Structure 1
Amino acid sequence: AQNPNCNIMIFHPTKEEFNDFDKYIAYMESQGAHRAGLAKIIPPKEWKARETYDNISEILIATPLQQVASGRAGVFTQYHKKKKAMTVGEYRHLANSKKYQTPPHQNFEDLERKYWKNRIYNSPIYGADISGSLFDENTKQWNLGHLGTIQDLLEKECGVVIEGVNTPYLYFGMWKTTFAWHTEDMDLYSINYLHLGEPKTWYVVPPEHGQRLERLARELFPGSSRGCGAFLRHKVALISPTVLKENGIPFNRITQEAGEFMVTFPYGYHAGFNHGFNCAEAINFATPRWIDYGKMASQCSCGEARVTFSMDAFVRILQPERYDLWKRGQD
């Protein structure tokens, strides 16, 4: 069995290997990459996403979200308070302000220490989940707006044509902006390209051990767990690496820098934080190997998770027994 310790693998595809996206995902899996839940892909030196980032300031962040924490430093939830619209230029200035800017630090490990010590005492503002793309239309390799769609994959594998669309999303971050512990909708893959700016640190639990994280989470957030049998779908709970280690939860960590891709694999729980002002693009995707995970994915039906239009067909076709309850949670 390849990668039996479930380490995060880093790949350096050549320009030739960068042509065929599906083929390379399958290659990474042949080497055991998916066992970690997360892989990093460093693009060949010949590749670029676009020519420059000099002209992005006028993008609108219609609903910036202030991420307010509750709990203790290593075990907390966050809620998202909606703020007034602002441009990316305005958001960048805010991120760089004394109130929000990254503190002085020695290295990534020092900044990680500072994150986990102090995150809860601040409320950073995240420009998350903005439909759009920063890839140039002429970028033919690993262009996240040009991937094969999940509806087409489902139709190819299973024969059923379904409604729905699959487009990318932009994320504008600042110091301490946080992504809570989650797997993707329907336990899909995700891919995330860090276009510009400061790094993103990731934590990940191997898919084969995801239920260990779920059991810890139920213990640590006992009210939330009574409320919903899949409350991590709410995407609000944080647990620090120190707490995970104290509880024997297998995990790994890695820092993504600008110009690098990360892929999350089906049922790979992940969480993390941004180091300073940055912009990432991400999308969900599927492969043949996903279908079995999609059939078994948990679902939130309590009303909280509320998701895209396109998840309806995935539930309907892959989880017909669950569909009526889930759709009620949508309504």
Structure 2
Amino acid sequence: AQNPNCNIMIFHPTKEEFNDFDKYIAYMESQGAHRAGLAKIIPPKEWKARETYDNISEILIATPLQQVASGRAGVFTQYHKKKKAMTVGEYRHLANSKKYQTPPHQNFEDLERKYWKNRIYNSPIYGADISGSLFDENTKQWNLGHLGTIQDLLEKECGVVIEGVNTPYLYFGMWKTTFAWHTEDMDLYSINYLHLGEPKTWYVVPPEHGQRLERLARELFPGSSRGCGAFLRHKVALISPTVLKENGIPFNRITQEAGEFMVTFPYGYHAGFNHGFNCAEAINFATPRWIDYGKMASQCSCGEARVTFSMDAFVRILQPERYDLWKRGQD
């Protein structure tokens, strides 16, 4: 069995290997990359996502989210308070202000220590989940707006044609902006490209150990657990590496820098934080190996998780028994 310790693998495809996205994902899996839940892909030196980032300031962040924490430094939840719209140029200035800017630090490890010590005492503002793309239309390789769609994958594998679309999302971050512990909708893959700016630190639990994280989360968030049998779908809970180590939960960590891709694999729980002003682009995708994970994915039916239009068909076809209850949660 390849990668039996479930380490995060880093790949350096050549320009030739970067042509066929599906084939390269299947290659990485042949080497055991999925066992970590997360992989890093450094693009060939010849590749670029677009020519420059000099003209992005007028993108609108219609609903910036202030991430307010409750709890203790290593075990907290966050809620998202909606703020007034602002442009990317306005948000970048805000991120660089004395109130929000990255503190002085020695290295990524020192910054990670400072994040876990101090995150809860501040409320950073995240421009998340903005439909759109920063890939140039002429970029033909690993262009996250030109991937094969999940609807077409389900149709190719299972023969059933379904409604829905699959488009990318932009994330504008600042110091301390935080992504809570989650797997993807329907335990899909994700791919994330850091277009510009400061790094993003990731934590990940191997898919084969995901239920260990869930059991810890039910212990640490006991009211939330009673409310919903899949409350991590709410994407609000944080647990620090120190707490994970104290409770014997297997995980790994890695820092993504600008110009790098990360792939999350089906049922790979992940969480993380931004080091400073940055912009990422991410999208869900599927492969044949996902189908079995989609069929088994947990679902939130309490009403909190509220998701895209396109998840309807995935539940309806892959999880017909759960469909009625889940749809009640959506309505």
Shared fold (TM-score, shorter chain, > 0.5): yes
* CA distance in 1: counterparts of 2:313 and 2:154, whole angstroms: 10
* CA distance in 2: counterparts of 1:41 and 1:164, whole angstroms: 28
Q: Which residue in 2 is equivalent to 1:47?
A: 47
* CA distance in 2: counterparts of 1:185 and 1:206, whole angstroms: 17
* CA distance in 1: counterparts of 2:9 and 2:159, whole angstroms: 34
The one-character-per-residue Cα deviations of 1:166-204 (angstroms, maximum 9, x if unpaired) are: 000000000000000000000000000000000000000
* CA distance in 2: counterparts of 1:296 and 1:74, whole angstroms: 30
The one-character-per-residue Cα deviations of 1:122-177 (angstroms, maximum 9, x if unpaired) are: 00000000000000000000000000000000000000000000000000000000
Matched residue count = 331
* Structure 1 position 267, deviation (Å): 0.0
* CA distance in 2: counterparts of 1:316 and 1:234, whole angstroms: 21
TM-score normalised according to structure 1 size: 1.00
* Structure 1 position 45, deviation (Å): 0.1
* CA distance in 1: counterparts of 2:165 and 2:50, whole angstroms: 24
* Structure 1 position 278, deviation (Å): 0.0
* Structure 1 position 235, deviation (Å): 0.1
RMSD: 0.1
Give unmatched runs, 5+ long, in structure 1: none
Return structure 1 stretches of 4+ with deviation > 2 angstroms. none
* CA distance in 1: counterparts of 2:300 and 2:127, whole angstroms: 25
* Structure 1 position 103, deviation (Å): 0.1
Secondary structure at the counterpart of residue 172 of structure 2:
strand
* Structure 1 position 82, deviation (Å): 0.0
* Structure 1 position 312, deviation (Å): 0.1
Q: Which residue in 2 is equivalent to 1:56?
A: 56
The one-character-per-residue Cα deviations of 1:186-242 (angstroms, maximum 9, x if unpaired) are: 000000000000000000000000000000000000000000000000000000000
* Structure 1 position 71, deviation (Å): 0.1
* CA distance in 2: counterparts of 1:308 and 1:184, whole angstroms: 12
* Structure 1 position 83, deviation (Å): 0.0
* CA distance in 2: counterparts of 1:178 and 1:111, whole angstroms: 14
Q: Which residue in 2 is equivalent to 1:136?
A: 136
Secondary structure at the counterpart of residue 192 of structure 1:
strand
Secondary structure at the counterpart of residue 203 of structure 2:
strand
Q: Which residue in 2 is equivalent to 1:37?
A: 37
Give unmatched runs, 5+ long, in structure 2: none
* CA distance in 2: counterparts of 1:219 and 1:167, whole angstroms: 36
* Structure 1 position 6, deviation (Å): 0.1
* Structure 1 position 76, deviation (Å): 0.1
* Structure 1 position 275, deviation (Å): 0.1
The one-character-per-residue Cα deviations of 1:68-108 (angstroms, maximum 9, x if unpaired) are: 00000000000000000000000000000000000000000
* CA distance in 2: counterparts of 1:226 and 1:75, whole angstroms: 18
* CA distance in 1: counterparts of 2:46 and 2:125, whole angstroms: 35
* CA distance in 1: counterparts of 2:80 and 2:168, whole angstroms: 21
* CA distance in 1: counterparts of 2:188 and 2:16, whole angstroms: 26
* CA distance in 2: counterparts of 1:44 and 1:156, whole angstroms: 30
* Structure 1 position 255, deviation (Å): 0.0
* Structure 1 position 289, deviation (Å): 0.1
Q: Which residue in 2 is equivalent to 1:98?
A: 98
* CA distance in 2: counterparts of 1:90 and 1:2, whole angstroms: 47
* CA distance in 1: counterparts of 2:25 and 2:264, whole angstroms: 11
* CA distance in 2: counterparts of 1:23 and 1:250, whole angstroms: 29
* CA distance in 2: counterparts of 1:281 and 1:31, whole angstroms: 26
